Amino acid sequence: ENIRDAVRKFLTGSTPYEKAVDEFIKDLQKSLISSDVNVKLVFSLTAKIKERLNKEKPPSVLERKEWFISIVYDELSKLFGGDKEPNVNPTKLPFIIMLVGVQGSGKTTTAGKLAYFYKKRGYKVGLVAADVYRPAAYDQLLQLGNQIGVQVYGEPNNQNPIEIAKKGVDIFVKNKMDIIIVDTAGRHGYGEETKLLEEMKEMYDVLKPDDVILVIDASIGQKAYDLASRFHQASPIGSVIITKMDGTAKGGGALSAVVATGATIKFIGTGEKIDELETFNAKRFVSRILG
Ligand SMILES: Nc1nc2c(ncn2[C@@H]2O[C@H](COP(=O)(O)OP(=O)(O)O)[C@@H](O)[C@H]2O)c(=O)[nH]1
């Protein structure tokens, strides 16, 4: 968002177009690089911009400055996810959504937010606490459920996440929930991403969820590429939610990195409150950062 005031500087006029453009371009590069966006993506973005500038003459009836900003808007939009806005509604009821992610990525919180998101859309939602590796997670999700009138199945003394998840899903299915959101986890520690993907697959093979969602903490910046890519390869149907887009400068890096894998981002988390979840739209994200 540091570019917001930079874009303002460019638009309000000051210096002749060509000099002002070049100055904006370098400022853009500085901001993106500072947001941990991958260097190749930054330079490729700039080159495509010049290529558009140096090939698309704006009609005379339009302000050059305005036109240049539109192109930047367009190209930034592609960097952060394109124009296709994902479908987040169930394809059938009941609809089982499975959440996976490393420790601390905001999974439990995101489970709560997703429940709220769907409840506001008129769905009956059930939450399943199947994270057996962090003990306090059941109670944490329970408090989230209590906050929004959504029931939470859990078994605090059971160390088999698959048995819990399966029983949780079965009980919500029998009681006719529309949407069932399972909060899962793999083992912490060495090879956390390997343990995560193996545990995800075992759970997937038993639940047969309709939707698998990797939860990624934005604070890891462009390092999100590795897990998003391994997840995308292991689960071509899977999508991503990026959390804490409000608690770091590296959110740009995370978002662009995930996008570069070809994985779909369905929602972003924008804070600690249970209502702070939005469907992801790249153009809307760019408007906010452009001003
Ligand atoms: N600022 C911000 N904080 C978040 C967001 N999502 C989660 N958190 C915080 O991240 C911490 C861990 O979240 P949690 O759901 O417990 O992660 P988990 O360990 O993967 O289940 C908590 O302190 C949350 O308040 C978000 O979108 N924005």
1-85 and 86-279 share one CATH topology? no
- Ligand 1 centre and the CA of 247: distance in Å? 10
- Per the DSSP assignment, residues forming a β-bridge with 183 are 99, 129
Residue where the block lists tokens 């399966």: 166
Euclidean distance between CA atoms 131 and 165, whole angstroms:
9
Burial letters 163-199, b for 16+ CB under 10 A, else e: ebbbbbbeebeeeebbbbbbbbbbeeeeeeeebbbeb
SS3 state at 243: strand
- Shortest-distance atom of ligand 1 to CA 102: 20
Task: Kindly report the CATH class assigned to 1-85.
Answer: mainly alpha
- Ligand 1 centre and the CA of 25: distance in Å? 35
Which residues approach ligand 1 with their CB closer than 6 A? 101, 103-109, 134, 137, 243-244, 246-247, 269-272
Instruction: Using DSSP bridges, classify how beta strands 151-154 and 125-130 pair: parallel, antiparallel or unpaired.
Output: parallel
- Ligand 1 centre and the CA of 81: distance in Å? 23
Going by alpha carbons, the residue nearest to atom 6 of ligand 1 is 106
Euclidean distance between CA atoms 252 and 249, whole angstroms:
7
Q: At what angle do helices 39-53 and 64-79 cross, to 10 degrees?
A: 140
- The experimental technique used to determine this model is X-ray
Going by alpha carbons, the residue nearest to atom 11 of ligand 1 is 106
Homologous superfamily of 86-279 = P-loop containing nucleotide triphosphate hydrolases (3.40.50.300)
Measured in angstroms, the resolution is 2.3
Segments making up each domain of the chain, as ranges: 1-85, 86-279
